Design a protein around this ligand. Structure first.
Ligand SMILES: CC(=O)O[C@H]1C(=O)[C@@]2(C)[C@H]([C@H](OC(=O)c3ccccc3)[C@]3(O)C[C@H](OC(=O)[C@H](O)[C@@H](NC(=O)c4ccccc4)c4ccccc4)C(C)=C1C3(C)C)[C@]1(OC(C)=O)CO[C@@H]1C[C@@H]2O
Ligand SMILES: CC(=O)O[C@H]1C(=O)[C@@]2(C)[C@H]([C@H](OC(=O)c3ccccc3)[C@]3(O)C[C@H](OC(=O)[C@H](O)[C@@H](NC(=O)c4ccccc4)c4ccccc4)C(C)=C1C3(C)C)[C@]1(OC(C)=O)CO[C@@H]1C[C@@H]2O
Ligand SMILES: Nc1nc2c(ncn2[C@@H]2O[C@H](COP(=O)(O)OP(=O)(O)OP(=O)(O)O)[C@@H](O)[C@H]2O)c(=O)[nH]1
Ligand SMILES: Nc1nc2c(ncn2[C@@H]2O[C@H](COP(=O)(O)OP(=O)(O)OP(=O)(O)O)[C@@H](O)[C@H]2O)c(=O)[nH]1
Ligand SMILES: Nc1nc2c(ncn2[C@@H]2O[C@H](COP(=O)(O)OP(=O)(O)O)[C@@H](O)[C@H]2O)c(=O)[nH]1
Ligand SMILES: Nc1nc2c(ncn2[C@@H]2O[C@H](COP(=O)(O)OP(=O)(O)O)[C@@H](O)[C@H]2O)c(=O)[nH]1
Ligand SMILES: [Mg+2]
Ligand SMILES: [Mg+2]
Ligand SMILES: [Zn+2]
Ligand SMILES: [Zn+2]
Lengths: 62, 426, 430, 426, 430
């Protein structure tokens, strides 16, 4: 299906104060991606810039 | 005197037959009620060809309406001309064919077929001198593609000597309105190549092509396509319903145009066809009718005749014209297009002329052509079938009705045999 | 003639039916209390009595009384036959084992009795329209229990289903994966064509197109009712290409087990937006093939279309359907499998879509309902089984199930079966 | 007998053709509705030269109307005489030439050339004995300069023996309305020199000069220029539409007027021309018509003939006049003006006399001159071309369509060759 | 047939469009609500919907909601399609990086969808009319983002672009040179005809001819709208010499990159002045060529004319036109390049100019719009890059750009690229 860096990205309805996982900026639109394993959210414009799933999820476990 | 039995099968066949009854009742001056109201005696002279006389000077068509759903029967009976048929002739079940060839041929309408032949027998026995049968159906779907062919087989078994003349709307790739059309077509033409003596192959793509590029209709419905098909249907039987300079029975057409037994798949056409906005500018004389009649755009099948050569061709003119003129044009077309005709037949053109043109027209010309290019229609369907049958897709629905894959293989084998035969002489 | 039996199970199914019969009554001009002021167009769904009363061909069942107590008191109290509104005593409590083995056991013999009485009034019965939810306790257990009997008593009759399927992120229960995983055996063996539907997809559709920021469940029901009305329009009305209910399945289903098509409807549009565009046949045809308009949260671009039925209704000319389908075919985004060169079934009906007077959906001279057997829906299952695997690894909530007469192994045997189904949709994708 | 197939291409060609049809329909007494309403039988005697007969005694022009924008076709169709044309020959695209010759010849017009040639085939087949083709176009812009030459090449290939006779409005320096006119003219004349047998040069500058100094129009529009061009357009074909003392077919014109194969570019003219306030003062007699006809101002090309000499002259008189008088005048003109005629041709003047003058006139005289002075028109455009091609200005638009600078070089080579041939005899 | 898509970006572009669509609706007689009380003259700019409503073929985009919110509340609320009026969340803040890389990247996929749906309606599309400002953040970044996408999606179609350009003295922002120098890549590589205009010249025009001492931006927009209406007049109306949109470029553009003509209009005059003077063809033709009437503050005498397009509209005859250009050649002030001895493209249209009722422009029987590719515009670049060089020497404002995903080196590559363009405009001048 989709493994650009190595995980799923499915649409989520985004609200309130949020931040990209790569830009570390704020998302303005009401759309966002989300990996159910990595538990992140991105602009829809930084999908290829992230690391692979293994990197991000092993990072998330600090 | 050369009486014809009329049958319908499936939704397409029923609709086109209804429009055919429209056209020919208009020609004969028959009221919607069945009362005669025409102008000339020549309308009444051969009225027996299509209609049985009934008391009160009523006329009832010799039509057998067969369909496995009640919906289309209710549609025709509530139509502009539904009251004209005989109530006894509506033979129909309840459960639809489900676009399944096996359902029609073996399981569901195999019950209804016994009722159908008994009515057809009554109509045939009521006639003085039966000439042939004329059937309308469609090769897609399951109602037409199975029931029409089973009925063809039974009537052929009972009436081996009478002519059989079926009109067949059959699929095209870009105008496909059903997923399983290749299976149904390959199963139905496997019989049509055997039993029928003539088969008038029709195609929605060519009908829409004429509706757009020639008629310039903005929104053509199926009604206009049925009108176009019924035009040729009325044209071909013209020689045995009116006087003429050259009379040609359906048997005469078959004798001239069918060289070998199995190359009997026909390509029809019509002239004149004009857009309304341009009819005032055209001249309807013999030369331009002849030009338009042989145009590649004017034929009712998607196959371009320029990809093949004609075995034989028939021109049924109607109107008042010079015989010398018609002969000269039919020589000129065959001479200047000599590359597009088989040269092992010295003369490919057959001409007939009747004196009664269609109403509102001063002249008309119905075209029929037996061309090798028709193989492109028959190749393509097989090429579609090979896409599905190689992985047995959708086969459980057919095998649930007792059908076997060996019959599918044999049907495709007969397909490749027929297309090879058409290719051999090209 | 050409009748259909509409069984409604679970709260979701019962409320969807409450919307659906509301739509039908407006369609055929029947009053909400069952009379008809002034064709047999209603004969498919309504049986006619000598007093001029049209009784629906429906059976409402729920093991708890609340929702059917509402319908027995609402405006449509006078529409339904009193004894086809069947209620139990104990709520299924979101448990497949209760709905199938213990509490749904008692009420099944009455439900099949009423179905038999409805069937005996038919002359030309065609199939079943079952409405239920995958997550619900009654919506899984009772539908399995009922279908196991229906497949043996009326085996030949086709069986059409309309199911609400668990979403990626939206979820209203914790054991939804177990309940769905147990409903899979029913939907595999004793079904012929079932339509998945997802709440979040319609939520996003209503947010984007209808411009309502926060809809209720009634909005979802008023679109699912529109879809089922579009399915049955060919059966209740005249048309250029009327599609039979068995022809429908023969086109949709390539293999015995591959029968889980997506469904979508167009033009889903508000009343204010509709005045500023034309909604030609080409535009609405192109609308169905966007990911923005699918009713299941899955990308069609990640799979291959296998078979698409386009049911046009209203002022649609077949020229336009031909031109639209050719335009769809030339696109390299909409990918079909190699072994189905035909692809598209087309039906055209002359009845325009009816707007519910209190509804939001605009009035339009045309509508197209697109149903697509496609491989992308496999990813929708690859989601949900992965939700199961984490829980059953711990034997998380199993004691409630096993405690109510369920065998433990049925869990594993369920998880195996979907592993065969999810395989097959990939296996045919080559 | 001697039918002419007429074609229009580009905005200017379409406009001049539209006025030309109105003028001759006035001559033949044809109503805007296509119905005949004339007085004399001589109008109907040779109506077939330009018009096909259609039912109801209607007459449709044998016109092929070609363009790459629909705007000109919309203008003509809603014009004074738009309804007379047959809708079928309105062949047109959607994207225009953009004043790009390569767009006309290779990319956009190459797709429509098949469509126009098909209709030209129908019109030519309807003819009994086709004589030649009669194309109106302009050498500026992209539609005319490209598509007219492409179609000329095609028709020359398919009909090598029939006359190709074109009328060309072509650039001038002080009345230029397009920056890229030199490139387009250089590319177009490279084809016209090879294919056409008669090309009639026309200049907007000279037409404005006629309007100002001779007609004394205060505000001459393009309609007046089209009127002036249409006058000679009708004049040249008079001998094959009306009887006369000396009948000169266009082939007979070509034989006398083209001493050598490529020197066929002609300068036209018309007489009498007077201001509407002074026509009461003139005596129209043949000597005065002759004097105005040979005046340098009277010719519709900017080339003043006094910087050159005449190879051949053709005077097509119309009306009842004295043959001895015409011979006397045409002898005295070439004798007293001997320095401006090539002495190696013993007689430089062809004379034809039709018995029917233009409507409203008693006598008329159409003038054709094959003169070396036309080299000035052929050498000025080249000096414009050499100005731009030396720095490759604007060539990216052309080379984007597949064109090469090599074809530009060969076109300019052929242009200087033609200028050298015209100069070699002066 | 013969359609054009009008995209308006930035505050300046949006307000110019508000003037332009006000000028078109009155010219074709369309009401502000989109109806037409009573010939396919409007077909180029308006799409016609079955209710008898004309919707303009336009796309309004601004990354801050303010200006388009005014458009959505003003008199033309009912004219535009509500969904093609696109608004973002955050203002670009006069920053090329924010418009191009950061914020506009979210809305580009929506504006392209709007443009695609507009194009799918168009049967005979020709090109694009992009209106924007060089000084603005959106008007520089978003146009750069959008033109690159259009040049790959619709590479064959023309792209006409309309611009407000920084002036010698008048200016409203500090980093206008940065935005302009960054926009220069877009204009060079993905455009075919960009029309420069500046505020100061039109101000001086209104001071001298229109006799208004202190006008607003609306007065300038009511002249820019007149210029574009004059350009499209040959397309929307019949004429003696109709100039196609591609023919226009074929006469304007001699080299691939020299595509920046000046624009000017005549007779710009007040209602009081016109009664005292005739305004024949010759005088308006002369009126185009003085330095006073240029819309960019440069002296044409300093640069050689390369190509001129005179679009006359109204009661004009070709005789007078040819007479006037004979004199314009006869001058020693209206100089030209040696290698273009034709020079003048001429178009003539029969429709007189339309006067807006509240405008301060007089009614006149004749009008002429002169659009001139000339070398003098190079001086205008020689100005603005010198404004860049002083600031970039200190890295004066750079940290804002680099903070939003912009590479530093792209500044130098921009300054490099303009050094090639100003060279080219000089190199052809010999
Ligand atoms: C003044 C005039 O020219 O009227 C014509 C006409 O305009 C044209 C365009 C007619 C017209 O046909 C159509 O518009 C048409 C549309 C869709 C499909 C088929 C036809 C006409 O309707 C059709 C009609 O034809 C007939 O009446 C024939 O007898 C036909 N029967 C019927 O059409 C019919 C209609 C209603 C009920 C029953 C019959 C027929 C054809 C074949 C064999 C036997 C009979 C005619 C003369 C005309 C009109 C009325 C405009 C044309 O039809 C025929 C069959 O001649 C279409 O091109 C031809 C050429 C004609 O010029
Ligand atoms: C009383 C009288 O002398 O009337 C003349 C006339 O005054 C003059 C001035 C006419 C007149 O022509 C013009 O004023 C004119 C203006 C602009 C462009 C061209 C012509 C006349 O309009 C022109 C018109 O000519 C014709 O009718 C010819 O047959 C001509 N056909 C048309 O002009 C025509 C107009 C509208 C529609 C259809 C045809 C023709 C020429 C060559 C070949 C075939 C036909 C005539 C008799 C006159 C008027 C009316 C004043 C002249 O025209 C011709 C061609 O004869 C211009 O100088 C000549 C000499 C005439 O004396
Ligand atoms: N679209 C829609 N979904 C509903 C509605 N009502 C319930 N559901 C869905 O149904 C799912 C839960 O199933 P249940 O409500 O438990 O169905 P049930 O058969 O009553 O289950 P039990 O109460 O345990 O018997 C959830 O995904 C709900 O979103 C409704 O009115 N509209
Ligand atoms: N003629 C005219 N010029 C305007 C108008 N509005 C703004 N401008 C000019 O446009 C230049 C500034 O551009 P901006 O207004 O910042 O464009 P922008 O895209 O909205 O800027 P951002 O908000 O940062 O995206 C200045 O030279 C202004 O003079 C107007 O209404 N008419
Ligand atoms: N010319 C014409 N074609 C039709 C008509 N109705 C259906 N068709 C076409 O013919 C084919 C016949 O299929 P169908 O009759 O529906 O299946 P069946 O009823 O089981 O035989 C359709 O797929 C359509 O493509 C009609 O009324 N006129
Ligand atoms: N006599 C006359 N000349 C015209 C007319 N229209 C245009 N012209 C001139 O002829 C030339 C033809 O150019 P044009 O046809 O517009 O370009 P094209 O459409 O690409 O062939 C113009 O440059 C004008 O100088 C007209 O109506 N009558
Ligand atoms: Mg419940
Ligand atoms: Mg702004
Ligand atoms: Zn980001
Ligand atoms: Zn991940």
């Amino acid at each position: 299906a989709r493994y650009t860096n190595g995980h799923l990205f499915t649409t989520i309805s985004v609200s309130g104060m949020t931040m990209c996982y790569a830009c570390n900026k704020s998302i303005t639109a009401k759309e966002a991606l989300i990996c159910p394993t990595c538990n992140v959210t991105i602009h829809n414009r930084c999908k290829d810039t992230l690391a692979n799933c293994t990197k991000v999820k092993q990072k998330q476990q600090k | 005197m050369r009486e014809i039995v009329h049958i319908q099968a499936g939704q397409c066949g029923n609709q086109i037959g209804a429009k055919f009854w429209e056209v020919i009742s208009d020609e004969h001056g028959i009221d919607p009620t069945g009362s005669y109201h025409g102008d000339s005696d020549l309308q009444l002279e051969r009225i027996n060809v299509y209609y049985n006389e009934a008391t009160g000077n009523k006329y009832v068509p010799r039509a057998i309406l067969v369909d496995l759903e009640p919906g289309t029967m209710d549609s025709v009976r509530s139509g502009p001309f539904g009251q004209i048929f005989r109530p006894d002739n509506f033979v129909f079940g309840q459960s639809g064919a489900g676009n399944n060839w096996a359902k029609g041929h073996y399981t569901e309408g195999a019950e209804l077929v016994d009722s159908v032949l008994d009515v057809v027998r009554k109509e045939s026995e009521s006639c003085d001198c039966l000439q042939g049968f004329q059937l309308t159906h469609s090769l897609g779907g399951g109602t037409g593609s199975g029931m029409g062919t089973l009925l063809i087989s039974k009537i052929r078994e009972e009436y081996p000597d009478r002519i059989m003349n079926t009109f067949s709307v059959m699929p095209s790739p870009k105008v496909s309105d059903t997923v399983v059309e290749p299976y149904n077509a390959t199963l139905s033409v496997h019989q049509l190549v055997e039993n029928t003596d003539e088969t008038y192959s029709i195609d929605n793509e060519a009908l829409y092509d004429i509706c757009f590029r020639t008629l310039k209709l903005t929104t053509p419905t199926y009604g206009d396509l049925n009108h176009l098909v019924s035009a040729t249907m009325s044209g071909v039987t013209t020689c045995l319903r009116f006087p003429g300079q050259l009379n040609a029975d359906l048997r005469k057409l078959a004798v001239n145009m069918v060289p070998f037994p199995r190359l009997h798949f026909f390509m029809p056409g019509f002239a004149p066809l004009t857009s309304r906005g341009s009819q005032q500018y055209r001249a309807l004389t013999v030369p331009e009718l002849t030009q338009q009649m042989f145009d590649s755009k004017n034929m009712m099948a998607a196959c371009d005749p320029r990809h093949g050569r004609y075995l034989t061709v028939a021109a049924i003119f109607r109107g008042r014209m010079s015989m010398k003129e018609v002969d000269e044009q039919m020589l000129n077309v065959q001479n200047k297009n000599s590359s597009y005709f088989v040269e092992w037949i010295p003369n490919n053109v057959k001409t007939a002329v009747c004196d009664i043109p269609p109403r509102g027209l001063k002249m008309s010309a119905t075209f029929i052509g037996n061309s090798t290019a028709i193989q492109e229609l028959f190749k393509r369907i097989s090429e579609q079938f090979t896409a599905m049958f190689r992985r047995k897709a959708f086969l459980h629905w057919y095998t649930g009705e007792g059908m076997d894959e060996m019959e599918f293989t044999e049907a495709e084998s007969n397909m490749n045999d027929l297309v090879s035969e058409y290719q051999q002489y090209q | 003639m050409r009748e259909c039996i509409s069984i409604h199970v679970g709260q979701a199914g019962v409320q969807i039916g409450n919307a659906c019969w509301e739509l039908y009554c407006l369609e055929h001009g029947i009053q909400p209390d069952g009379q008809m002021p002034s064709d047999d167009s209603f004969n498919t769904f309504f049986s006619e009595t000598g007093a001029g009363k049209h009784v629906p061909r429906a059976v409402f069942v729920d093991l708890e009384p609340t929702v059917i107590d509402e319908v027995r008191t609402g405006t449509y109290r006078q529409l339904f036959h009193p004894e086809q509104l069947i209620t139990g005593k104990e709520d299924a409590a979101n448990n497949y084992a209760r709905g199938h083995y213990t509490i749904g056991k008692e009420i099944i013999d009455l439900v099949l009795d009423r179905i038999r009485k409805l069937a005996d009034q038919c002359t030309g019965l065609q199939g079943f329209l079952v409405f239920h939810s995958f997550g619900g306790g009654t919506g899984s257990g009772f539908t399995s229990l009922l279908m196991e009997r229906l497949s043996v008593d009326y085996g030949k009759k086709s069986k059409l289903e309309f199911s609400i399927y668990p979403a990626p992120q939206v979820s209203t229960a914790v054991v939804e994966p177990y309940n769905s995983i147990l409903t899979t055996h029913t939907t595999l063996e004793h079904s012929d064509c079932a339509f998945m539907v997802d709440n979040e997809a319609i939520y996003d559709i209503c947010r984007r197109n209808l411009d309502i920021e926060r809809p209720t469940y009634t909005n979802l029901n008023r679109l699912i009712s529109q879809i089922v009305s579009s399915i049955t329009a060919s059966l209740r009305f005249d048309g250029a290409l009327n599609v039979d209910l068995t022809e429908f399945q023969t086109n949709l289903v390539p293999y015995p087990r591959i029968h889980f098509p997506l469904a979508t409807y167009a033009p889903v549009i508000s009343a204010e937006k509709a005045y500023h565009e034309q909604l030609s046949v080409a535009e609405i045809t192109n609308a169905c093939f966007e990911p923005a308009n699918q009713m299941v949260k899955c990308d069609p671009r990640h799979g291959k279309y296998m078979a698409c039925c386009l049911l046009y209704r209203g002022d649609v000319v077949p020229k336009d359907v031909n031109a639209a389908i050719a335009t769809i075919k030339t696109k390299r985004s909409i990918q079909f499998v190699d072994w189905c060169p035909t692809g598209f079934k087309v039906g055209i009906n002359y009845q325009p879509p009816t707007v519910v007077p209190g509804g939001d959906l605009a009035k339009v001279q045309r509508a197209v309902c697109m149903l697509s057997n496609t491989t992308a829906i496999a990813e929708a299952w690859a989601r949900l089984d992965h939700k199961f695997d984490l829980m059953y690894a711990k034997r998380a909530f199993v004691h409630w199930y096993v405690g109510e007469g369920m065998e433990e192994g049925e869990f594993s045997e369920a998880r195996e079966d979907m592993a065969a189904l999810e395989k097959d949709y990939e296996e045919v994708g080559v």
